[PDB]
Design a protein around this ligand. Structure first.
Ligand SMILES: Nc1ncnc2c1ncn2[C@@H]1O[C@H](COP(=O)(O)OP(=O)(O)OP(O)(O)=S)[C@@H](O)[C@H]1O
Ligand SMILES: [Mg+2]
Lengths: 279, 572
């Protein structure tokens, strides 16, 4: 009973999103957008039934593609550890409402999958044909992220220094950097938020998202028509459902009964940065 | 029978109480009061009493304990319980029964040495745990049934390892793990089993030991057994400036030449210091050696010598080693039919060394399981609803022959050996041996071989110029160095290694972190060779030299000349 007040105080702050994002794998350098996506996946959306008997998915699906050495398995392990229910496979029934991480991609479960390039390493010039999965299975994923080995002389030095500092200082002290939440506390907070309530969208946000979806569909049209080639990542109503689910998850993170326009804007920005860059 | 007399029984009980409340150590401290205070602080249920002190003070008790174990132990448990109640009356609320543990029994016997005469007697034995059951309640209590095999190092060749059953109660429950080497002090009792009588056709009693004290066989016992003369000889050897040369020359006297291979194998044998930076990631302190050789270079002889030298060693062949055989596997017990774990070769190789012969014959499916144990030195078995973790800290020495039977110097090392890149990456030291037609070297080989043949006739029964050490002395030196030295890398110049690693990156992309780790643990092992608590940069220089030699040995001929020219600073 006492922990309810603690969770309410934690979720009533104006900076819950930043604290949660920083709490997602503080050891890993960079990937703030990836950390936020992982956090909103862990919070997840809300499922809704229909009187006709039909059900709509309330879980988010993410896919990651990149060269080896981009710390993909570490994120999967951290997600499995943090999630109240978590399964890790090398490539479903026992998981109910949890998260299933799937490495080497080449029942109410959220799916987080990692995969490698067809040729082993990404080729920027070739563009498409670097993903072997068919568009039919690619459409199920709510978001797709691409990671490339951005070779910078200063970035390698910074990464080496960060790794060596993590190696050295870890026996000395194990303390939060800046207000980071403990693993058990974050686990209980996520469970409490998931159990307590689930929000719904608003009319103005719905109209804004509809207009943005129409504009994005026209843009994907024009890109495909000018390129004279079929995009391996199509845009359909499932993308709109994914954006709605991400906005609902963002509203759920604040425990508000109704979603705001800021959540929809953040969901649209994340969806753009992931899919449009990937596509 | 004489003990069962009430008078002597009670008198001995009170005499044991006086022993508990009266003994004084050499420093003037009543040890058992400190022990009982510690146990009360920890809320344990057992008391440990040294048998040596009891024998020194009361000879009659030391005579009686092996002869009438059960009754006397029950009396001592009652005496300890009442002493605790008198000293700590509240302790009845946390515990209702306290058991006395007997440690350091002078008589140590092997599983092979068990006969009828030892029935219902306290015996101390040594072995390795193979399988264990779960915690079982009794309508009397905690129960543990375990299966113990003889230690593979002590077992002579050609004869199977024998297995026995052991029982643990209450506190001793869950005090051991499968694959752990332990010694036991316990009662050798017999059990009545009608199934054995029906099968064999005559009365047979299955003898099961009821252990009283369990102690994992860490090398602390071996350290205690060391004679001070051994320590003084080792220290006198350590101050020699040419200790390294004689140590390297002392390995494989019967084999001529091949300095690099024996250097690398000794360096791997001495081992590094395993580290756990932060408890977040574990950096291994083990060296995995790969030996690719043209036929006729006595690789099997080296492996056999390593097998003999090591205190704990297991030998396996390529064809006879399956994935299930090498690792622990889940099996249903033929009698009780609960899932049990049987340790593989690697699990029994924990803290020891494992030798793989003809590693190029490995099936890829069998290869897959190897990487986990190589990288993490631990195995996670998830089978038949049982998920368990077992320690796999072992030093692996593998032998291989190039495809086609001859090593081609015009090809990369990866092409000549039918192994995947990750497997080679897991290895820290790579050594390739070729065959050259050199008349003077042929003369040396022939002369040394014929001399060795003449020397070792049953009727009749160096490159560095240093006299080899005796085998027993070398083994004692290895044990002491393994169990005493812990070097510290407080005087390493990071700029030199950083520049060298940048050059390594340049000349490797022209043609990783774990290479740095291997060099670090190599320097640590070289420091351990010299018995130095702190590492001198000479260790780093020698580790760099040998690592660079190993790296250039794996390259094509068209580039190794340029590599030698570039790195002539360090090789000189
Ligand atoms: N350099 C050497 N010095 C002394 N004896 C040697 C040497 N090389 C080979 N021998 C002898 O040759 C015998 C047979 O060598 P092997 O160990 O069978 O050859 P190998 O290099 O292990 O290749 P494989 O594994 O047999 S195909 C050894 O037992 C030694 O007696
Ligand atoms: Mg051989």
């Amino acid at each position: 009973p006492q922990e309810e007040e603690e969770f309410r105080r934690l979720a009533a702050l104006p900076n819950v999103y930043e604290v949660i994002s920083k709490s997602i794998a503080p050891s890993i350098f960079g990937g703030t957008d990836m950390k936020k996506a992982i956090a909103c996946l862990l919070f997840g959306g809300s499922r809704k039934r229909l009187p006709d008997g039909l059900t709509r998915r309330g879980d988010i699906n993410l896919l990651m593609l990149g060269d080896p050495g981009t710390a993909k398995s570490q994120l999967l392990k951290f997600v499995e550890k943090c999630s109240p229910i978590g399964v890790y496979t090398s490539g479903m029934v026992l998981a109910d409402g949890g998260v299933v991480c799937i490495d080497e991609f080449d029942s109410r479960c959220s799916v987080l999958a990692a995969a490698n390039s067809v040729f082993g390493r990404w080729d920027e010039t070739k563009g498409e044909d670097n993903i072997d999965f068919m568009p039919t299975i690619l459409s199920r994923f709510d978001m797709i992220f691409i990671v490339k080995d951005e070779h910078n002389e200063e970035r390698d030095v910074m990464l080496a220094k960060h790794v060596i500092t993590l190696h050295v200082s870890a026996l000395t002290q194990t303390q939060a950097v800046e207000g980071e939440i403990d693993l058990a506390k974050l686990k209980k907070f996520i469970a409490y938020c998931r159990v307590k309530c689930g929000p719904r969208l608003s009319a103005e946000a719905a109209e804004k998202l509809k207009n943005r979806y129409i504009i994005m569909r026209s843009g994907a049209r024009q890109h495909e028509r000018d390129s004279d080639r079929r995009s391996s990542i199509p845009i359909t109503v499932r993308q709109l459902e994914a954006i709605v689910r991400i906005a609902e998850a963002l509203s759920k993170m604040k425990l508000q009964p109704f979603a705001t326009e800021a959540d929809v804007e953040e969901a649209l920005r994340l969806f753009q940065v992931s899919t449009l860059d990937a596509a | 029978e004489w003990v069962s007399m009430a008078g002597p029984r009670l008198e001995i009980h009170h005499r044991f109480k006086n022993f508990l409340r009266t003994h004084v150590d050499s420093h003037g401290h009543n040890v058992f009061k400190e022990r009982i205070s510690d146990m009360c602080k920890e809320n344990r249920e057992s008391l440990v009493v040294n048998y040596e002190d009891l024998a020194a003070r009361e000879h009659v008790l030391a005579y009686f304990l092996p002869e009438a174990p059960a009754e006397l132990l029950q009396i001592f448990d009652e005496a300890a319980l009442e002493v605790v109640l008198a000293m700590y009356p509240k302790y009845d609320r946390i515990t209702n029964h306290i058991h006395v543990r007997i440690s350091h029994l002078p008589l140590v016997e092997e599983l092979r040495s068990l006969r009828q005469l030892h029935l219902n007697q306290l015996i101390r034995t040594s072995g390795v745990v193979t399988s264990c059951t779960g915690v079982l309640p009794q309508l009397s209590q905690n129960y543990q049934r375990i299966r113990i095999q003889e230690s593979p190092g002590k077992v002579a060749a050609g004869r199977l390892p024998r297995s026995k059953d052991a029982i643990l109660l209450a506190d001793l429950v869950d005090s051991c793990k499968p694959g752990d080497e332990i010694e036991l002090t316990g009662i050798y009792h017999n059990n009545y089993d009608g199934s054995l009588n029906t099968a064999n056709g005559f009365p047979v009693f299955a003898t099961v030991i009821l252990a009283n004290h369990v102690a994992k066989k860490d090398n602390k016992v071996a350290v205690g057994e060391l004679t001070d003369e051994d320590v003084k000889m080792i220290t006198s050897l350590s101050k020699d400036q040419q200790i390294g040369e004689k140590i390297f020359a002392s390995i494989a006297p019967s084999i001529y030449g091949h300095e690099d291979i024996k250097r690398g194998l000794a360096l791997a044998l001495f081992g590094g210091e395993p580290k756990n930076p932060g408890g977040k990631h574990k950096v291994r302190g083990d060296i995995n050696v790969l030996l690719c050789g043209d036929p006729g270079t006595a690789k099997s002889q080296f492996l056999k010598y390593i097998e003999k030298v090591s205190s704990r060693a297991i030998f396996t062949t390529g064809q006879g080693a399956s994935a299930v055989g090498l690792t622990a596997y889940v099996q249903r017990h033929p009698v009780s039919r609960e899932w049990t774990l049987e340790a593989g070769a690697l699990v029994l190789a924990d803290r020891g060394v494992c030798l793989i012969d003809e590693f190029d014959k490995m099936n890829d499916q069998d290869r897959t399981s190897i990487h986990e144990a190589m990288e993490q030195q631990s195995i996670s078995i998830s089978k038949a609803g049982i998920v368990t973790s077992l320690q796999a800290r072992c030093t692996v020495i593998a032998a291989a022959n190039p495809i086609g039977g001859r090593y081609d110097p015009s090809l990369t090392f990866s092409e000549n050996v039918d192994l995947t890149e990750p497997i080679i990456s897991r290895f820290d030291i790579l050594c390739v041996v070729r065959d050259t037609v050199d008349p003077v070297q042929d003369e040396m080989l022939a002369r040394f071989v014929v001399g060795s043949h003449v020397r070792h006739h049953p009727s009749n029964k160096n490159t560095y110029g240093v006299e080899p050490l005796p085998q027993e002395v070398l083994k004692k030196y290895i044990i002491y160095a393994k169990e005493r030295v812990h070097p510290k890398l407080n005087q390493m110049d990071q700029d030199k290694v950083a520049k060298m690693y940048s050059d390594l990156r340049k000349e490797s992309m022209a043609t990783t972190v774990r290479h740095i780790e291997s060099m670090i643990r190599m320097a640590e092992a070289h420091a351990r060779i010299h018995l130095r608590d702190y590492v001198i940069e000479d260790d780093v220089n020698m580790a760099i030299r040998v690592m660079l030699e190993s790296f250039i040995d794996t390259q094509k001929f068209s580039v190794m000349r340029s590599m030698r020219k570039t790195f002539a600073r360090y090789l000189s």
